[PDB]
């Protein structure tokens, strides 16, 4: 609703988008009018009319005079072409980004941080039509607060088995396991942990009897044999 | 030497001193405004990024040793199954040697220090060259009797003079259009570079990149750290 | 042309000006009465030089004619009599009798008027005094305005500065961006939570309107004799037309291959079919009803699309793209489009209309 | 001396397999590669009227007949500068906690 | 990992069932499996003792 009201600050806001749209709709008309006004000028010739030059002057000197117009108007025509090529080059890069933007942000969710709508975790994005282009509305998740916890490097049970997390993007804190991007605490499961040959000092020291408290899913194979 | 040398026009209308080049061209309607961000804010941005790769939490109480950040970034691409101390000092020793070697280089090819130096030198030279080319066009009399409009009006009758001054009005206005056209080209080149730079920091500096070869050529990219540079950034991948 | 605001508008030959920074000329002496100054080398002996200092004067200095202010300066250049920059522009001359040097400056200096909210709220200038409240001494220039307060809401940003709509100037503060938690193995960490979703907007242009220029008719104006001289220029006209046509064709093929539309996605893109349970998509989706216009069902643009099109398009709708069928009639006085078509410029329709573009947007949604 | 620039050998990247001989890279060392990226241009504002006419009152009348050329110059320059200003001012976000 | 040499003992959670065997797979028996995968729990053996 705030976007809708804003259409009735800075980059990546509605105000910047509106300014860009206005320049797009104005740029084309400006170039054409500047081209057509060049016909008014007489490039140091008798007149801006070729027929008037030929009527007033003799054929030999008239040819020299119209060379001023031919060179003058042709140079003014070359400037218009050079200006359009710059816009065509600029737009070509713009639509290539737009094609990447729709393929990676609209039709799918993007891992690339900051690509779809600046900072924040991009959840989805939708598109609206706009004069000679697309207006992208990128919906990004912004966290209001932060949960302060103590990340554990891993487990060392019986000082014999080093047991650490497998997924790099997962944290084991105080015990819970949760994503490092959003606070979704979860009870640890043995499938989340993998065995490591060498333990380190930073690991939490544990015993085989205390381990099932940390990992309720753990199956103590031998304790369950001595029963 | 420093960006503060960027001249001021406050003393330019004073008229009690012979005009230097900056004032001599400001008398022709050309005013070079200061760059958008000075080196101080640019360096602050670079320092902010470098200090944020070791910010492990919301508050400053979560400051980390840099080895911990490197260790996490190593686990991101391959779970370290034998984290020996020696395995870590080797990387630290290699980085220390390599960072000093760049330092000595500043005091060959693409993606090296020498290529970056040439680009930076061209950046600081290009803007001055275009402005000087614009100002030197004033001395040319574009097929007129003189390059001075007042001189033409004194020598000739107002009817004939209007033709002569129109030769240089066309000539100067065309020279002014050439300066704008090559300025827009420069602005389009920088826009492509700035979009990449924001793309580069978001995917290589503020996070580790899964796109192979994106952050500094081939190999597995661990981190990148930014430094300020004349009118831009210098990425160390 | 009385108000300086009106003066600026008339210089821009527009009744309404977009917000920005507009070049401006320092207000010179309203009553001209310019004294005449004349300096030249002595001849025969006899010296006839005379000059007026610190007043905008019409001067002839050693053959250099112009209008400017002559001011005594403290330099003591020992060589020459008059001095110029590298571009041959007179900077100072020497009173040959006494050796003092006088600098020559323009009578008026360029200024930048800050035009926001349809008013001149401030002036960037090199002069310390003007017709405003206060002057702020920025490091590079003076800034005159009617509000010396700090600028915290820069409506118009430019170079290192930003100006508010009240006329206040300031620096653009370094915005505090979104914080990102660097990953780590151990110690205190902070997991973000209480997520709230915010929409950031970005406009991306897809195409330009193709323009075909018949260089023969633009240059020669249909004159058959002039076409003979144009042929002596070989491929100048040929390459102009080739460049324009190639650009249009590349852009056309790219955006026709880009805009792929699925029918089922369209069926789910209507307000009746879509169900954003809790997510209000009414402003994002467009209505579609059976159109009496040739029976074909029409889908109107969404509310946001209508807002983005109507208020911005100077002609209201994209269908106002003129047709040249009525241009060759000649039974009416030519308008702008017909007048420029008579000069060999034909603005062909854009590659895709707003309807197909809106259809593509609805397909993605 | 002159010479053809030799084709520099790249860093070998192992194509993933299913079975058979494979090679796993090991004993890494970190090398830093530098890349300079430009962010902005110094804005330049040209007063078209005083550049062309040199402050001459009578020459400004003739310049008025050129309509919007002397205006499009200034408009394009300041518009480009404003886009650069807003883009890099929004791009540079600074966190004091990281500072 | 294929990107770094980080040797590690296989874990039961690293493997997943497949409908059909293939000729390139290594030929094994339930007695050899715990040697290959120390984490494997032989349900029949652990219940029959
Ligand atoms: C260039 O410099 C010369 C030398 O400074 C200037 O000539 C000086 O002009 C003033 C006034 O025109 C002379 O003042 C004299 O005062 C006496 C006493 O009141 C009076 O009797 C004289 O009739 C005259 O007014 C001054 O003597 C004279 N200096 C000389 C001749 O050496 C000259 O004005 C400067 N500017 C030019 C030449 O454009
Ligand atoms: C983040 O790490 C810091 C240290 O790296 C932890 O700070 C320490 O926290 C403990 C317990 O909160 C403090 O112990 C006691 O603090 C209370 C006041 O809160 C007081 O009775 C004594 O001063 C006692 O020492 C300890 O002082 C403190 N150390 C500091 C601040 O240097 C912090 O607990 C960690 N974060 C979390 C969420 O645990
Ligand atoms: C890698 O793949 C190769 C073939 O694809 C496997 O065969 C091994 O190839 C090496 C290289 O020739 C043999 O080593 C040498 O073989 C020659 C044969 O006359 C002989 O001079 C020696 O016996 C020497 O060892 C190796 O014997 C051969 N092994 C087998 C079982 O065919 C190879 O096993 C694969 N793995 C490795 C680690 O090479
Ligand atoms: C977890 O255990 C490690 C392993 O150290 C051994 O076991 C301990 C219970 C203790 O008996 C140590 O002396 C044993 O060497 C502990 O790591 C030790 O930490 C102390 C701290 O001062 C240090 O002096 C020892 O050198 C470390 N031993 C090493 C590196 O082998 C660790 O402190 C225990 N606690 C935690 C929270 O990790
Ligand atoms: C692993 O087993 C496959 C499956 O074949 C069966 O199991 C074998 C152990 C043996 O008992 C075969 O007789 C069984 O049919 C083996 O695949 C066989 O490969 C040979 C060699 O070409 C072929 O002649 C057989 O037809 C294959 N049997 C099939 C496809 O069912 C395989 O050789 C065994 N060993 C290895 C290293 O893969
Ligand atoms: C400076 O000029 C400004 C612009 O007018 C003055 O500010 C307001 O001026 C209006 C009328 O011009 C008054 O009605 C307001 O009371 C003024 N103050 C406000 C709106 O806060 C101002 O009075 C002038 N003098 C100064 C600032 O000393
Ligand atoms: C407007 O902004 C300027 C620029 O920051 C301020 O100037 C300094 O602001 C700091 C703020 O911490 C003060 O400590 C300094 O004393 C200020 N110096 C000067 C010379 O002013 C300025 O104070 C702000 N406010 C006004 C009314 O100008
Ligand atoms: C979803 O958006 C629609 C917009 O169409 C809202 O409906 C309008 O709400 C305004 C409130 O300011 C009313 O004045 C209009 O009469 C409503 N109808 C229109 C514009 O057709 C609606 O309230 C929003 N929320 C929902 C549907 O839950
Ligand atoms: C754990 O199981 C192994 C395997 O049978 C056995 O050798 C060991 O004795 C068991 N641990 C204890 C404490 O009994
Ligand atoms: C520079 O690099 C070379 C080889 O890469 C290395 O031998 C040398 O030690 C480095 N310089 C320093 C100062 O470490
Ligand atoms: C005179 O010139 C000197 C430089 O030579 C300058 O510093 C001074 O401000 C000038 N004005 C005086 C001394 O009144
Ligand atoms: C934000 O998260 C904190 C966690 O520290 C929680 O206590 C608080 O209730 C949350 N705010 C809400 C749910 O509005
Ligand atoms: C002009 O007006 C007359 C009125 O009798 C009408 O018949 C004719 O069609 C009109 N022509 C045009 C070109 O409007
Ligand atoms: C790194 O590892 C390789 C293979 O594992 C070994 O050949 C080499 O000597 C090692 N480099 C050292 C120890 O510096
Ligand atoms: C293993 O146990 C399951 C269930 O108890 C049984 O169906 C299967 O036949 C057993 N296999 C062997 C080889 O004993």
Numbering used by the authors:
A (entry chain B): 1008 to 1015, 1026 to 1191, 1202 to 1254
B (entry chain A): 909 to 1015, 1026 to 1155
C (entry chain B): 464 to 507, 638 to 958
D (entry chain A): 761 to 859
E (entry chain A): 1206 to 1254
What's written in the study?
The PEDV S consists of an S1 subunit, an S2 subunit, a transmembrane domain (TM), and a cytosolic tail. The S1 subunit can be subdivided into three domains and two subdomains, namely the domain 0 (D0), the N-terminal domain (NTD), the subdomain 1 (SD1), the C-terminal domain (CTD), and the subdomain 2 (SD2). The D0 modulates the enteric tropism of PEDV by binding to sialic acids (SAs) on the surface of enterocytes.
Having obtained the recombinant PEDV PT52 S from the IPEC-J2 cells, we subsequently determined its cryo-EM structure to a nominal resolution of 3.1 Å without imposing a symmetry constraint. The structure exhibited a D0UUU arrangement as opposed to the predominantly D0DDD arrangement for the intact virion-derived S protein structure. Two of the three CTDs underwent an 82° elevation from the closed conformation to adopt an open conformation that was not observed in the structure derived from intact viral particles. The D0-up conformation of the recombinant PEDV PT52 S also differed slightly from that derived from intact viral particles. While the identity of the PEDV receptor is currently unknown, the CTD motion observed in the recombinant PEDV PT52 S strongly suggests its involvement in host receptor binding. Despite the variations in the glycoforms between the IPEC-J2 cell- and HEK293F cell-derived PEDV PT52 S, the atomic structure of IPEC-J2 cell-derived PEDV PT52 S perfectly fits to the most representative (82% of the total population) cryo-EM map of HEK293F cell-derived PEDV PT52 S, which adopted a D0UUU arrangement with a lower nominal resolution of 4.5 Å due to preferred orientation issues and smaller data size.
